[PDB]
Amino acid sequence: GSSGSSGTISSGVPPELPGPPTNLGISNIGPRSVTLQFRPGYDGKTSISRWLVEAQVGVVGEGEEWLLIHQLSNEPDARSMEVPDLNPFTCYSFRMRQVNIVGTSPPSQPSRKIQTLQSGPSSG
Numbered sequence: 001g002s003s004g005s006s007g008t009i010s011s012g013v014p015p016e017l018p019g020p021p022t023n024l025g026i027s028n029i030g031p032r033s034v035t036l037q038f039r040p041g042y043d044g045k046t047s048i049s050r051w052l053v054e055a056q057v058g059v060v061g062e063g064e065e066w067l068l069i070h071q072l073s074n075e076p077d078a079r080s081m082e083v084p085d086l087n088p089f090t091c092y093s094f095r096m097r098q099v100n101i102v103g104t105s106p107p108s109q110p111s112r113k114i115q116t117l118q119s120g121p122s123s124g
Contacts, residue, residue, distance in 0.1 A: 013045075014102075015046040015100060015101050017044050017100070017102045017103055018040070018043055018044040018100055018105045019042030019044070019105065020041060020106065020108040020109070021038045021039055021041050021098065021108050022038070022039060022108065023037065023038055024037065024038050024096060024108065024111050025038075026112060026114045029115070030116070030117055031118060031119045032085065032088055032119060033082050033083065033084045033086055034082070034083050034116070035081070035082050035083070036053060036083050036096070036111070037079065038079070038096045038108075039079065040076075043076075043098070043100070044098075044100055046100045047100070048100055049073065049074075049099050049101065050071055050099045051072045051097060052068055052071050052096070052097030052098075052104065053068065053069055053070035053072075053081075053094060053095065053097070054067060054068050054069060054094070054095050054097070055069045055092050055093055055094045055095070056093045057087065057092060058090060060092070060093045060113060066107060069083060069085055070082075070084060070085070087116060088117060088118055088119040089115070091113050091114070093110040093111060094111050095107050095109070095110050095111070
């Protein structure tokens with residue numbers, strides 16, 4: 001953009017909403033816990049208050065709903081985090097979200113389909 005009208009701005013300015021974080025990846029996929037990496041695109045002239053991590057059950061496509069599963073509060077300096085409470089031996093997805101004094105941004109592109117390890121003994 002490139003424009004501006006008469007006036008001044010120096011006293012009080014409300015914050016804005018963040019942006020959709022990218023560079024999402026699914027690594028260290030454990031049994032019921034995995035590490036979801038990401039990067040804060042646009043904070044919104046304000047640090048994040050809490051990150052929202054949603055996921056879907058089996059079916060990973062439109063029509064269904066996305067509910068929260070993992071959320072990191074008070075930690076705007078967390079490039080990545082672990083997502084506990086995961087369904088083992090089940091195809092699930094994961095996303096990211098930013099929350100600030102403004103509000104909660106929309107859902108970001110979901111990660112590729114993966115397979116959670118099994119919950120129990122299984123070695124050798």
